[PDB]
């Protein structure tokens, strides 16, 4: 676990909500990730931006919690090559949990407790994988993109939407998160960047995608352009 | 006035009335389960209590008329006689049982030891609160001091959260040889969240089938309204289901049943002028509907300003003697009344 | 809404005669002469080349190239638009009508029956009236002819060069898209109400208690559409302001030869 | 004319109820309990004060335009009728002669 | 002349009440719950504007 730091750049745009719009320059205001920004390189608070490029599949799920003990409740995602499994069952987390492959002593002691099960198809499929996590008045999204990449050690630079992926309505407390491997020792490497309330101001072309968007609190030339839209 | 002079007035509108009413609804037919919070006899107490999050299941609250003869049933963001045609995006029930003098403590802009100290709500709640009497149910003979209520804490509750860390805590005494005034009552909130978006818990009544290219009304699981619905062409993705423009209105639907996309449009209306010459002269009139092709509706006669009934086109021009619109002008002329183009001045 | 009294009537009233005046200031400004007057069909003035302000025979809509620059280079609940009365090709008529009066005529097609002169009599005519004699233009006439030729040449790439040539037209555009589209999105506030959809609240609510939120709306809408007609109100008081002025120009720059300073431009005025 | 259906319109604005159970003080000050009577008659007193304000706006407005017809009229007594005009259509069309 | 009154006016009319219990919000808010607080507030807002 080495640190590092890089710049965001105009990364972690997604469509606020399910409304079809064409040929409008809109306006709205939530959390979101801010243009040029630095960000953690690793080898909670309001929300996470999640990026990798990894093809060994050595990443899969994450962990939520906010007491991190099996007395509460916390949010346990596993995802394997054919589904995705979700619990918000209890757990209770070993020191450095991870996927043993294929037992799941080291992931949890047991589950005593269990409220919301979901399964589905799995998320994960030179490329490069976005995910946006953000849980608000009690229910929690997902948002992803996958995108070819070119050889490029940072982030690449240009304008992609993140379409949203999953909505849970689990209602729980998180506070942390960490991140799950499967694993023989090796090295990886990810992004990660925390989002906090912005306004911005989102383009939309004939077809309904997102192509530009304007970050109103940069410098006064960005709110020189959204006072005058 | 009884006598009208020369001119062209503008006098009414007009508008084109529905035909009929269009209803869609999910397939779905589940029941929610809002008899098993009910008649489970056994509630919790009023400062440790449940939640329960309704959805993907039909709404249905007669059926709450026909449980139980209710002593308070009071509703804030609704009316309650009309329960069974909206539709929620999120129900959230909350089930204790308190005293009976207690009941009136907990609501909005209330203040009270069971209002502050168990549970609290917003000052822009949206709900409804039930209440009964379950003397003969929740009260022992001998005193049932099972039920308890807190009453001593250094802050005050947010709303919508639960306590249950522990003497606040003090034990009731309910017996059948109390009266009104302390015997207890079982009381729920339920807790809605009006978006005016597509939503799990719908209404009881069942859809119809689906038209097109005729003025009608629609009810799409909550967008009420009327208007012409046509096939559309606008490439929605998978979550996409409203459309807007740059004034910010509907202007497409996803059908819940089939997966498809509408186009609405507003019906035909305007504006109706009435041309006359004065009433010495003559008593005939003709009608300009205005901004209309003449299909919404001598006997007709298509201009730019709009469609004329009542008035002849005629090749010659002349002097203007009463305005129009985009260049004719009509006139009173083996008597009618004729439009024509207008005329600028004599060739020199 | 029935209760609150008769607003709408006014409202009407002064929407009714703003359209009435827009119409009467355009009547005002171009109808002045009472003959359609051609020009001739042999087109030699005496070298003078009109070309570029006469009508242009091959296009559809009879417009002079000049006009067709100006024409190019300048780009619902309840609201409607009315046409205006007269159509693009009847003003074109009128302009035409006053050039070729003016070419053939003078200054005396304004005062009564319009008498033939010769273009270059004419001319000298006109430099008598600025204190030059007439042989100063007889002795000088290719000079002043091809001066005039070049400085009518030069007017069309002066209008498309200067991006901002026709801002004045283009103000009244934006401003009244702009008072449109503030109206129209006014419809989506709330005004301290549950919401800004009536059919919402009259399926939410017991009739009794749905009063108290139709009310704020209502007095919402009035006070916006009030604020909407007044605005337009004072503007068209400008407009016509600036549509007598033009009137006036038209009879005394166009109709005749001013002696008034920089009234017709910045020099000894000749003609327009 | 206008001036007539001004003044009309503004004194027939006074039997609207803008609102309230009654469009006259007496009565309803009369029968209601003033403690919810006050409200009541504010918002008689709101609508009334709108078409106040709203009848010396619109007096203003035409007073502009009549300044103006008037300040054109003053220039036209002294130039066509002190004294002989040159300007074209002025005075008349025609070569001017006196007024 | 017309300015200065125009604005000394504008100003002067900070101080009045609208029908409501006072003219300060502060007094208002440190007096008064927050749901009733906000039935004195718009009488100020809508005679300010
Ligand atoms: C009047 O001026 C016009 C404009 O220059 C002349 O038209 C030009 O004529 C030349 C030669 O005939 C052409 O090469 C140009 O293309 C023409 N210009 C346009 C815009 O069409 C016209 O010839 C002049 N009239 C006379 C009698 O000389
Ligand atoms: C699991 O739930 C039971 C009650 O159903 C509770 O008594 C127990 O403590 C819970 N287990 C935990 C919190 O680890
Ligand atoms: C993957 O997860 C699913 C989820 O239940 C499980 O059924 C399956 O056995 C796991 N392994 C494989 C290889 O699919
Ligand atoms: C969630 O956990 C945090 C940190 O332990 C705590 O401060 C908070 O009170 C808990 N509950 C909520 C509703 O945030
Ligand atoms: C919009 O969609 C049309 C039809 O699929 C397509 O031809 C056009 O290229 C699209 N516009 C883009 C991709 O900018
Ligand atoms: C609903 O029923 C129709 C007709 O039987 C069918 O075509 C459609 O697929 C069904 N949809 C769902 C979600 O069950
Ligand atoms: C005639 O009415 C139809 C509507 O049915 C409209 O589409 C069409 O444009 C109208 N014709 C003309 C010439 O405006
Ligand atoms: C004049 O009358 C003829 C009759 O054949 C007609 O074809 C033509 O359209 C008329 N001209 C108009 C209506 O302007
Ligand atoms: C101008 O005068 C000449 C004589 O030199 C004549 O041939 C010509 O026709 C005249 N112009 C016109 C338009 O008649």
């Known amino acids: 676990r080495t640190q590092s730091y890089t710049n965001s750049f105009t990364r972690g745009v997604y469509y606020p909500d399910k409304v079809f719009r064409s040929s409008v320059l809109h306006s709205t205001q939530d959390l979101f990730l801010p243009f040029f920004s630095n960000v953690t390189w690793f080898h909670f608070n309001d929300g996470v931006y999640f990026a990798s490029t990894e093809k060994s599949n050595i990443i899969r799920g994450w962990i939520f919690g906010t007491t991190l003990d099996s007395k509460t409740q916390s949010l346990l995602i596993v995802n394997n090559a054919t589904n995705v499994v979700i619990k918000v069952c209890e757990f209770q987390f070993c020191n450095d949990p991870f996927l043993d492959v294929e037992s799941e002593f080291r992931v949890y002691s047991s589950a005593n407790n269990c409220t919301f099960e979901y399964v589905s198809q799995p998320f994960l499929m030179k490329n490069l994988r976005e995910f946006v996590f953000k849980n608000i008045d009690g229910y929690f999204k997902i948002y992803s993109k996958h995108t070819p990449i070119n050889l490029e050690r940072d982030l690449p630079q240009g304008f992609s939407a993140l379409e949203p992926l999953v909505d849970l309505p689990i209602g729980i407390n998180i506070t942390r998160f960490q991140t799950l491997l499967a694993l023989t020792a090796g090295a990886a490497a990810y992004y990660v960047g925390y989002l906090q309330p912005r306004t911005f101001l989102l383009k939309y072309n004939e077809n309904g995608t997102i192509t530009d968007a304007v970050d109103c609190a940069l410098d006064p030339l960005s709110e020189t352009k959204c006072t005058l839209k | 006035s009884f006598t009208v002079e020369k001119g062209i007035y503008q006098t009414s509108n007009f508008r084109v009335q529905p035909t009929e009413s269009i209803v869609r609804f999910p397939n779905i037919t589940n029941l929610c389960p809002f008899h098993e919070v009910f008649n489970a006899t056994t509630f919790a107490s009023v400062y440790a209590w449940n939640r329960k999050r309704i959805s993907n299941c039909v709404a249905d609250y007669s059926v709450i008329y026909n449980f139980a003869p209710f002593f308070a049933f009071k509703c804030y963001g609704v009316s309650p006689t009309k329960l069974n045609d909206l539709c929620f995006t999120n129900v959230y029930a909350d089930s204790f049982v308190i005293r009976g003098n207690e009941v009136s403590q907990i609501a909005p802009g209330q203040t009270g030891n069971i209002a502050d100290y168990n549970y609290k709500l917003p000052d822009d709640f949206t709900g409804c609160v039930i209440a009964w009497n379950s003397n003969k149910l929740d009260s022992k003979p001998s005193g049932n001091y099972n039920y308890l209520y807190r009453l001593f804490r250094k802050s005050k509750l947010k709303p919508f959260e639960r306590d249950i860390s522990t003497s606040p805590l003090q034990s009731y005494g309910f017996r059948p040889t109390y009266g009104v005034g302390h015997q207890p009552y079982r009381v729920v909130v339920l807790s809605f969240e009006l978006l005016h978006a597509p939503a799990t818990v719908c209404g009881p009544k069942k859809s119809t089938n689906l038209v097109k290219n005729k003025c009608v009304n629609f009810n799409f699981n909550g967008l009420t309204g009327t208007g012409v619905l046509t096939e559309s062409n606008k490439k929605f993705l998978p979550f996409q289901q409203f459309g807007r423009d740059i004034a910010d209105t509907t202007d497409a639907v996803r059908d819940p049943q089939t997966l498809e996309i509408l186009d609405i449009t507003p019906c035909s209306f305007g504006g109706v002028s009435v041309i006359t010459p004065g009433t010495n002269t003559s008593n005939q009139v003709a009608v300009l509907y205005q901004g209309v092709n003449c299909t919404e509706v001598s006997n007709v006669f298509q201009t730019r300003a709009g469609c004329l009934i009542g008035a002849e086109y005629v090749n010659n021009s002349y002097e203007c003697d009463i305005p129009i619109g985009a260049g004719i002008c009509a006139s009173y002329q083996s008597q009618s009344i004729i439009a024509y183009t207008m005329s600028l001045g004599a060739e020199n | ?272």
Not at chain 3, 173 to 184: E, G, P, S
Not at chain 3, 233 to 250: D, G, H, P
């Open chain 3, 1 to 272: 809404l029935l209760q609150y009294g008769s607003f709408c009537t006014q409202l009407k009233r002064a929407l009714t005669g703003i359209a009435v005046e827009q119409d009467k200031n355009t009547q005002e400004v171009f109808a002045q002469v009472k003959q359609i007057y051609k020009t001739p069909p042999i087109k030699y003035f005496g070298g003078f080349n009109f070309s570029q302000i006469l009508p242009d025979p091959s296009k559809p809509s009879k417009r002079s190239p000049i006009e067709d620059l100006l024409f190019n280079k300048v780009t619902f609940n309840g609201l409607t638009v009315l046409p205006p009365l007269l159509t693009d090709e009847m003003i074109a008529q009128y302009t035409s009508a006053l050039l070729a009066g003016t070419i053939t005529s003078g200054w005396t097609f304004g005062a009564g029956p319009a008498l033939q002169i010769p273009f270059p009599m004419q001319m000298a005519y006109r430099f008598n009236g600025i204190g030059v004699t007439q042989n100063v233009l007889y002795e000088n006439q290719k000079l002043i002819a091809n001066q005039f030729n070049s400085a009518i040449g030069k007017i069309q790439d002066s209008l498309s060069s200067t991006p901002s040539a026709l801002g004045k037209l283009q103000d009244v555009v934006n401003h009244n898209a702009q008072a449109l589209n503030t109206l129209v999105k006014q419809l989506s506030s709330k005004f301290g109400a549950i919401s800004s959809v009536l059919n919402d609240i009259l399926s939410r609510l017991d009739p009794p208690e749905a009063e108290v939120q139709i009310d704020r709306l209502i007095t919402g809408r009035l006070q916006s559409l009030q604020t909407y007609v007044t605005q337009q109100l004072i503007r068209a008081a400008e407009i016509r302001a600036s549509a007598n002025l033009a009137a006036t120009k038209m009879s005394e720059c166009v109709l005749g030869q001013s002696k008034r300073v920089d009234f017709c431009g910045k020099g000894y005025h000749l003609m327009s």
